[PDB]
């Protein structure tokens, strides 16, 4: 697997707006709500459970980095993977996506895989 | 880098009168860690080495002969000497202790009135 696969989607000019650290099934998790830096589009959510999916080892690294971009408020481009989480009350709460990466964004283009 | 503006440069009071002596620095001297003011007052009779008078801008030394206690401000101090006698004609200096680069004031000379 990779972060810049064609199967994985990407959303550009995403400013992280929220954060939520809980625990489900003896494993913590976190979910971010990224919003466009212009006012267009829809806010997309990308959770990351500690040890549930294939994107398990990068939970700690993506939690330190999700708190950096959420504090400084800089626009970044996020990549996700759709239809991952399947718990009923969990998907209806945040999303079914899985946060796979976090690329910084310059004034012209992003520093990410295309 | 911390300047000390002592004033007046030369003073003369009559015996039996209270005496004021002002000082000023470019920045505050209260340390939020030690919770003290790091300024002192010295006395130097002509031909003699100076002698400490106040510890932390408000508490005199062991042998002090009932002197004054400077105003516990940030960068503004007064009331160095008191009860002028026949032997209180000396040079009164000031000094910082906010860092290891100790900066001394200009000075002050007491005399007699006619």
């Amino acid at each position: 697997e990779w972060t810049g696969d064609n199967t994985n989607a990407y959303y550009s000019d995403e400013v992280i707006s929220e954060l939520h650290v809980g625990q489900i099934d003896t494993s913590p998790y976190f979910c971010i709500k990224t919003v466009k830096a212009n006012g267009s589009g829809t806010p997309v959510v990308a959770c990351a459970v500690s040890k549930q999916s294939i994107w398990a080892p990068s939970f700690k690294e993506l939690l330190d980095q999700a708190r950096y971009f959420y504090s400084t408020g800089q626009s970044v481009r996020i990549h996700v993977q759709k239809n991952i989480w399947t718990y009923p009350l969990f998907v209806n709460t945040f999303s079914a996506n899985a946060l796979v990466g976090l690329s910084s964004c310059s004034a012209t283009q992003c520093f990410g895989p295309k | 880098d911390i300047v000390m503006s002592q004033s007046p440069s030369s003073l003369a009071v009559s015996a039996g009168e209270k005496v004021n002596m002002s000082c000023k620095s470019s920045q505050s001297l209260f340390n939020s860690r030690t919770r003290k003011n790091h300024l002192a007052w010295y006395q130097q009779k002509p031909g003699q080495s100076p002698k400490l008078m106040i510890y932390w801008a408000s508490t005199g030394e062991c042998v002090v002969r009932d002197r004054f206690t400077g105003s516990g401000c940030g960068t503004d101090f007064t009331l160095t000497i008191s009860s002028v006698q026949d032997e209180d004609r000396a040079v009164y200096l000031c000094k910082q202790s906010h860092n290891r680069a100790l900066t001394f004031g200009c000075g002050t000379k007491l005399e007699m009135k006619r």
């Binding site: - | 790091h38 002192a40 130097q44 080495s49 100076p50 002698k51 400490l52 510890y55 932390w56 030394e61 040079v91 200096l93 202790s97 290891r100 680069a101 100790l102 900066t103 001394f104 200009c106 000075g107």
Partner: protein, 118 residues
């Protein structure tokens, strides 16, 4: 009584060097940091530098860095100070204080008048 003792007056030629001393007795020599001060004819004091008698960890002024050198003797219980490239505007009296743990100098020397002329 704790008291510091310095050398007598000095008189040298411009361009020479001088070694001032500061003898202390009555306490453990490696307890108080000893500074060095210069008092011109205008009575305004100016620190030269300090040195910890334990480590000899010295630190000089931004103006006397290329002019002075501090040295501490732990055996003879005395300090030193060298002054090279002496010019006519380096004539003053040099003191030797000691830092009490309260951040003040209770013990001073006795003065050392240094004059340079031809």
């Amino acid at each position: 009584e704790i008291q510091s003792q310095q050398c007598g007056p000095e008189l040298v030629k411009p361009g020479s060097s001088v070694k001032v001393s500061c003898k202390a007795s009555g306490y453990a020599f490696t307890n108080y940091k000893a500074l060095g001060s210069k008092q011109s004819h205008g009575k305004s004091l100016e620190w030269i530098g300090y040195i910890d008698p334990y480590n000899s960890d010295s630190s000089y002024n931004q103006q006397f860095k290329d002019k002075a050198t501090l040295t501490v003797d732990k055996s003879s219980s005395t300090a030193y100070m060298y002054l090279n490239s002496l010019t006519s505007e380096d004539s003053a009296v040099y003191y030797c204080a000691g830092l009490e743990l309260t951040g003040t100098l209770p013990y001073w020397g006795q003065g050392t008048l240094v004059t340079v002329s031809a």
